[PDB]
Each structure stands twice: as C-alpha cells, then as structure tokens.
Amino acid sequence: DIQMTQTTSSLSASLGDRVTIGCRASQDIGSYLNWYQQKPDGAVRLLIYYTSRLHSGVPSRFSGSGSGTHFSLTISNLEQEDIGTYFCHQDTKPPYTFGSGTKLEIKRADAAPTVSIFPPSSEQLTSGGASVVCFLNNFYPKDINVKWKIDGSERQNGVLNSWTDQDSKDSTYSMSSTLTLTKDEYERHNSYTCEATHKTSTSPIVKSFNRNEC
Amino acid sequence: EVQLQQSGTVLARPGTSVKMSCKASGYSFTNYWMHWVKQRPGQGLEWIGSIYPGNSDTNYKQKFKGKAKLTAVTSASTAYMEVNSLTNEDSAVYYCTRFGNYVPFAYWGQGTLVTVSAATTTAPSVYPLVPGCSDTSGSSVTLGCLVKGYFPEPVTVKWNYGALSSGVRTVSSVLQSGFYSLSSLVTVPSSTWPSQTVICNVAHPASKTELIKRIEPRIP
Numbered sequence A: 001d002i003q004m005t006q007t008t009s010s011l012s013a014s015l016g017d018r019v020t021i022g023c024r025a026s027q028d029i030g031s032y033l034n035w036y037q038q039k040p041d042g043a044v045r046l047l048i049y050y051t052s053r054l055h056s057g058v059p060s061r062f063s064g065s066g067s068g069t070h071f072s073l074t075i076s077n078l079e080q081e082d083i084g085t086y087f088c089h090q091d092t093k094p095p096y097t098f099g100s101g102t103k104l105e106i107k108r109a110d111a112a113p114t115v116s117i118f119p120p121s122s123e124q125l126t127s128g129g130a131s132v133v134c135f136l137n138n139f140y141p142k143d144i145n146v147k148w149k150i151d152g153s154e155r156q157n158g159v160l161n162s163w164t165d166q167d168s169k170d171s172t173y174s175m176s177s178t179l180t181l182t183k184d185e186y187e188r189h190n191s192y193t194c195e196a197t198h199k200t201s202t203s204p205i206v207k208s209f210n211r212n213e214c
Numbered sequence B: 001e002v003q004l005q006q007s008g009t010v011l012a013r014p015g016t017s018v019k020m021s022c023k024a025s026g027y028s029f030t031n032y033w034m035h036w037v038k039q040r041p042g043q044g045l046e047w048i049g050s051i052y053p054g055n056s057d058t059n060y061k062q063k064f065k066g067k068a069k070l071t072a073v074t075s076a077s078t079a080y081m082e083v084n085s086l087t088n089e090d091s092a093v094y095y096c097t098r099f100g101n102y103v104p105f106a107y108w109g110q111g112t113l114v115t116v117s118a119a120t121t122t123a124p125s126v127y128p129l130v131p132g133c134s135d136t137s138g139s140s141v142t143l144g145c146l147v148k149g150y151f152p153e154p155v156t157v158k159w160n161y162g163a164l165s166s167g168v169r170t171v172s173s174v175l176q177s178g179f180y181s182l183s184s185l186v187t188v189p190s191s192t193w194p195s196q197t198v199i200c201n202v203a204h205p206a207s208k209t210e211l212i213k214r215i216e217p218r219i220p
Ligand SMILES: CO[C@H]1O[C@H](CO[C@H]2O[C@H](CO[C@H]3O[C@H](CO)[C@@H](O)[C@@H]3O[C@@H]3O[C@H](CO)[C@@H](O)[C@@H]3O)[C@@H](O)[C@@H]2O)[C@@H](O)[C@@H]1O
Pocket: A032, A034, A049, A050, A091, A094, B033, B050, B059, B099, B100, B101, B102, B103, B104
C-alpha cells in the first residue's frame, strides 16, 4: 500500500510561534491528502482536505501545502486550543492509509510543582492494603522525578507514576506517584517521604509524614 | 446535525467475535459511504473498509477480508462491523466515519473500545485521598480518590456529580500485573472542604458500576 510517514512523533512549540507538521507519501498522491486533529478524549476532527482546503470552523491560522509526495500542515501563530495529535490521510482510492500522528505540545514558561503527600486511608488499611500518594501539581516542563524514602531508605519497587494530559487552559502538567505496600509492611515503618526533582530548582521539594503522627 | 453514535465498550475472549454499531442521524443514511478505522495504541490509524447503505456495496483493505464484516440496516439507520477470531492485535478503538461529498471524513463517531482478554471484569476499589492530620497551610486543600485494581478500561472520574470541574486533575490509567489504576485530585478553597460534600464519582462501564466516595477528614 501507500505508506504515509510523519516527520516527527512529537512537537513542542511556544504560543504565537509558527508550527509545521510534516507528512510524506511513498508514492505520488497528487492533492489527495487530508489532516485530522485528535483530542485527548478521542474526538477526531477534519481540519484540512485536498492538501490545502480548510474545513468547518477551522481558524485562518491553518494552511496546507503539498508537492504530491511531501506535505505539511502549518499553524501561523500557535494558540492554546491547538493541543492535540495530528494525522495525515491519503484518499486517492482504496486502501486508504494514514500517518502515525504527531503529538503537539505547548511550550510554556517553566513552573515549579506544588507537592502534596497522602497517607493511606483508614478504609484501605482496614482491608489489609496501604497506598501512599505523592501529588505534584501544575508544573512545566513535563519531565519530573519523584524519589520515595521509607524510614530514610530509597524505595523503587511498588511505585507507579502517571501524568495528566497537558492542561488545555494554562499548559501545565500534574502527576501522581503511588507507593503500594501491605498494611503490615506499612506499619513496620514510621517515616514516609517523597522528593520531587524538577529543572525549576536544583534542590528537590520534599514532603514527609510520620506514621506515629508527627 | 450529523451525528455518528457508536456502541459502548466491549470485553471479548480470544477466538470469539464482537459486533459493534454506529447509528447515523441528521442526514440521508443511504446516500453516503460509511467507513471504519482502527486505532491501536502507538500504531497510528488503519483503514478497515467501507459500505454504501443504499445498495450494500462494500470494500475492504485486503487484510480485513474474512476478518471484519461490514453491514448496514436502513430501517435502523445503523452501520455494523463484526470482527471475528479475536486476538490481542484486535484490541483497539474503532471509529465509524462518513465520507463525502467533496470532502473526505467530515464526520466521526466517538469510537468503540474493544478489549480482547481472557480475564474477567473487575470493578475498581476506590479509596479517599485525605491530607495528613493537619500539617499544611492553608487556603487551598487538595483532595482525591485512588482508583485501584480494575479491568478492563475505561474508568471516568467526576466531582460532585460533575458540578466541580475547576482544579480537577485526573492522571492517565496505568497497567500493572493485569489490572488498571488511576487517581483523580481536586484542589478547592479551604472554606468548601470539609464544609461541603466533596464526593468523587467513579464509573466503570464494563462492570456497570457507579461508585461514590465521600471525602472526609481523618479520625482525631
Ligand atoms: C475536493 O477533494 C475532496 O473531495 C473528495 C471527495 O469527493 C467525492 O465525494 C463524493 C462521493 O464520493 C463517494 O461516492 C462515490 C460514488 O460512489 C465514490 O467515488 C466515493 O466513495 C469513495 O470511493 C470508494 C469507492 O470507490 C468508497 O470507499 C469511498 O467512500 C463524490 O461525488 C466526490 O467525487 C475527497 O476525497 C477530497 O478530499
């Protein structure tokens, strides 16, 4: 079939900047190249069809170009609402094929995380489990490290890390790190600590609690 | 005007078949081709085939002949796709999408998530996320719910039955040892909590469960 190749899988750019997303076809497809935008909730929307024609409610900021083999979607001036994943699509004739997408992130001013720590609930504890949660709120860039210390000793096992999607309004991220223990393991130690290292500060933000309650 | 309404998430055992639906409204169903597109995580988009409901003509990507079957029922204004001999490779979000006229895929369904697995449905356990016994100041409190041990996807979380949406942060689900977990957090003014019911609403479509978890201060 016709292989559609996208230039890059991810792109980061500042508000107001010109942004290009590229697509290449393994054969000449003339003008039969389309651009769809997919949002985090999975919604798909046609933006550009037949190489260069804008579809419904698409801002004048968007334009398309094509040589027949090399194509690009261009955003003149990046706006908040432009977050999403962009896919190209050739429809010369069946079988239709698609590029594998380019995820577009907004490059924001650096922002330090606000850190919160959550001891296990009595509800979980009574059931025999113990999860400890470190929450890092409203930071940029996405890259962030969370270190757990149990009774002062580093713990890597049983830790699960996850991020939100980039905030649609202010471009920040949040993330949680969850340390999973048995109740018995949890009650065998006193000090629970998470340390968050982020490029905004050379020193980590540290949050702790003591199982013996302060 | 034009809407494409797809069926809900499905869990299916390997080797069996699933049949999903795409109800069309707001246009003449029989006068436009309906296409189906497969999205597997980190595998882009794949075109499956299309059907013209007016005369029942179909085409397929060669790969999907005998694997996916497209049908349409005019009286119901509904397009169907039946995928047989299910393998892990068939776990995906499937979209129905309308083609034309003089535009390509102008209208899309919301997608149908298929999970192929031998594992049974497991409802999540929900635990409250409550600050430690009074140790941080002081105008904005962060609360939450830990959602643990569920299968398959998805789970959705909302706050105060959807009335609370500002300051809500819900992290992506993670898969570990066959099960999924996520957490949702909300940051609200100190005068709101513990004053008013901060409830998280946890829905798990596969198990048909709709859970609530009250967020209450710790026992002194
Ligand atoms: C301007 O460029 C855009 O317009 C192209 C779409 O234009 C066609 O849309 C009308 C409907 O065409 C479908 O119905 C025709 C007759 O059956 C088929 O040629 C079109 O169906 C597609 O072809 C496959 C069947 O061979 C079927 O799977 C597909 O649905 C037609 O009047 C216009 O030509 C769009 O591609 C360009 O972006």
